[PDB]
Design a protein around this ligand. Structure first.
Ligand SMILES: CN(C)c1cc[n+](Cc2ccc(CCCCc3ccc(Cn4cnc5c(N)ncnc54)cc3)cc2)cc1
Length: 354
């Protein structure tokens, strides 16, 4: 288990000792256990724990996750995390301070891309998302996030000047589509596509879904959605369409560009209907008491809705990725990823006949 540098060890020890109750309060520095869960320059994660020989005094956790930010948004993100914790839809919040958070450590692993298509996994994600979508949050209810964000990235993308030859050639090719005009065409399409405004996760990818340890038996209760940093009131179609897009991207791929894209992994009509068939009863509650006529019309229109909004997933994350090619320190093939998203966008446009 990778040890942090002595300084980070000492800081982590002091936060745990001061924010956590019970046996943590009298812990000595020499008794403190910590290891790295994820390095990097931002959102460093560590597991912190009591010695195995140390007894708890009450209901304090034996193990916690320390999240360190590194290099209004903090207020919103913080309040949102605390509310989800109170409602048991996220990890408990044990401590909050300018440099990070102490969270409940959830014994689990992330799902892999291939698991998204498993019937039981997909059905639970649908149910979890419908729950997420149904609740009240003290945030702006106007759906300006989607196009406001897309405009913001496009404005930045148009200003970008690369110096390295590969990035230069790639940006040229992406620019050749006339993105401002394409954004306008997308805007018009989505304007004519009704979709309820709900509290969306906005990044429901496999890496943000935990498979809970000790619960492979549980058909319906084995997942937790995490990482709500992008969450906002947004069109329901975006959340679902974005999730469907994520079937096609595997970020665990070990060589450059550090992802694999496969267009044929997008869910089939059957797979899509299985997802929405689980979503709709969880979101509407009495949905199954409607006529087969009405149920089918709702389902068919919803397929249209989410598949059109999947275009915005491609366009938004495509633009985002170009910006990250300029600003991010992370080892990821951002320009290659942007091209993959735009390739999918035009493919999806062709499939839809739009
Ligand atoms: C915005 N989009 C569409 C992107 C963004 C980034 N990428 C590239 C990329 C995606 C995913 C990854 C892997 C993400 C790792 C994040 C992570 C780390 C640890 C965990 C485990 N975890 C989190 N909280 C807890 C917890 N509280 N308890 C136990 N385990 C936990 C979950 C998720 C790396 C690069 C692609 C598309």
């Amino acid at each position: 288990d990778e040890q942090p540098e002595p300084r980070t060890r000492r800081r982590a020890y002091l936060w745990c000792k001061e924010f956590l109750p019970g046996a943590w309060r009298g812990l000595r520095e020499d008794e403190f256990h910590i290891s790295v869960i994820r390095g990097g320059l931002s959102n460093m994660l560590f597991q912190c724990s009591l010695p195995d020989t140390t007894a708890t005094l009450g209901d304090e956790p034996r193990k916690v996750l320390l999240r360190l930010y590194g290099a209004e948004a903090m207020v919103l993100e913080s309040v949102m995390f605390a509310i989800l914790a109170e409602r048991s839809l996220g990890p408990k919040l044990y401590g909050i301070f300018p440099q990070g958070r102490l969270e409940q450590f959830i014994p689990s692993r992330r799902l892999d891309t291939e698991e998204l298509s498993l019937p039981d996994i997909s059905a639970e994600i649908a149910e979890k998302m419908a729950t997420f979508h149904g609740m009240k949050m003290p945030f702006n209810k106007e759906p300006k996030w989607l196009f406001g964000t897309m405009e913001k990235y496009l404005k930045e993308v148009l200003r970008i000047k690369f110096t390295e030859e590969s990035r230069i050639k790639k940006l040229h090719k992406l620019l050749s589509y006339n993105l401002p005009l394409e954004l306008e065409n997308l805007r018009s399409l989505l304007e004519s596509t009704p979709s309820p405004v709900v509290f969306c996760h906005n990044d429901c990818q496999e890496g943000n879904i935990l498979l809970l340890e000790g619960r492979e038996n549980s058909e319906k209760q084995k997942l937790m959605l995490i990482d709500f940093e992008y969450s906002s009131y947004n069109y329901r179609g975006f959340d679902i369409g974005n999730h469907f897009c994520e079937w096609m991207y595997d970020y665990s791929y070990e060589k450059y560009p550090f992802f694999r894209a496969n267009i044929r992994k997008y869910p089939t009509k059957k797979q899509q209907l299985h997802f929405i068939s689980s979503y709709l009863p969880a979101f509407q509650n009495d949905f199954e008491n409607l006529s087969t006529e009405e149920k089918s019309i709702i389902k068919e229109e919803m397929l249209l809705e989410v598949n059109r909004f999947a275009l915005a997933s491609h366009f938004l994350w495509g633009l985002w990725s170009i910006v990250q090619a300029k600003i991010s320190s992370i080892e990821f093939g951002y320009m290659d990823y942007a091209q993959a998203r735009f390739d999918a966008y035009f493919h999806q446009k062709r499939k839809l006949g739009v």
